[PDB]
């Protein structure tokens, strides 16, 4: 009943706050200056980037930014894997299907959660102690200049739904438990879990935003936008693998991107 769905929503929220260091709660605090915390170092050009290296974690800038983005993604994939393992019934699935769900889900979730850290002007980095500007990321020489702009475009739309962490915790679980991912062995137990998560998400959206209406319906249209940004992103990564020499792709990302869209 309504109770079991409230319980799932609360378990997921607890597991989400645990799994991910920087929540949407904090990130907006930082972006609106509505905290007491020390404001983040702004990276708006080549000079500010160089002077920035004090606050962040490890030849040309476009390649150095890209390799930094790589290390954060890997950490993101690890955080999401821990969160997946908390989704009731997920670990009881066929391990090959666990791998398949992560393999296709993790970037849809990275992009979902990146939006929590973005506005139309830029993105919080290194757990909110940096703020890289959108203009700066566009300015980068191609193909690296086109890398982040689609994520910014998705983000301005997605942030309009004004979801909080408690809503996102279930939405993320629903994305992970997608029964239509290529190469799944046993769709049924996945669709069974996703059905419970979608009911939990629908209830959660009625209770947490009752002055809103079919926040639920609009939010489900965006799961398709997320597959497009992923497809589009895999293509730009395909280009970069070819057109660049002094850059290699972190092995965990090679596992994920190899034989994908």
């Amino acid at each position: 009943e309504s109770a079991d769905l409230r319980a799932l929503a609360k378990h997921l929220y607890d597991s989400y706050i645990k799994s991910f260091p920087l929540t949407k709660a904090k990130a907006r605090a930082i972006l609106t200056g509505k905290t007491t915390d020390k404001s983040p170092f702004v990276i708006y050009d080549m000079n500010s980037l160089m002077m920035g290296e004090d606050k962040i974690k490890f030849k040309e800038v476009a390649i150095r930014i890209f390799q930094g983005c790589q290390y954060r993604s890997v950490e993101a994939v690890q955080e999401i894997t821990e969160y997946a393992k908390s989704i009731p019934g997920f670990v009881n699935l066929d391990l090959n299907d666990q791998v398949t769900l992560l393999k296709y889900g993790v970037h849809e979730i990275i992009y979902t959660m990146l939006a929590s850290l973005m506005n139309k002007d830029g993105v919080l980095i290194s757990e909110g102690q940096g703020f890289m500007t959108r203009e700066f990321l566009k300015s980068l020489r191609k193909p690296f200049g086109d890398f982040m702009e689609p994520k910014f475009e998705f983000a301005v739309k997605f942030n309009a739904l004004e979801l909080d962490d408690s809503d996102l915790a279930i939405f993320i679980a629903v994305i992970i438990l997608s029964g239509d991912r290529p190469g799944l062995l046993n769709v049924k137990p996945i669709e069974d879990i996703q059905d419970n998560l979608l009911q939990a998400l629908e209830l959660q959206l009625k209770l947490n935003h009752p002055e809103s209406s079919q926040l639920f319906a609009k939010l489900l249209q965006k799961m398709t936008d997320l597959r497009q940004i992923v497809t589009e992103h895999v293509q730009l990564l395909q280009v970069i693998k070819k057109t660049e020499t002094d850059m290699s792709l972190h092995p965990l990302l090679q596992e994920i991107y190899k034989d994908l869209y």
């Binding site: 690890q78 894997t81 391990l95 666990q98 791998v99 992560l102 393999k103 596992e255």
Partner: peptide, 11 residues
């Protein structure tokens, strides 16, 4: 294949 994802999942 998917050694790391396997590792991350079993850890």
């Amino acid at each position: 294949r998917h050694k790391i994802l396997h590792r991350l999942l079993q850890e």
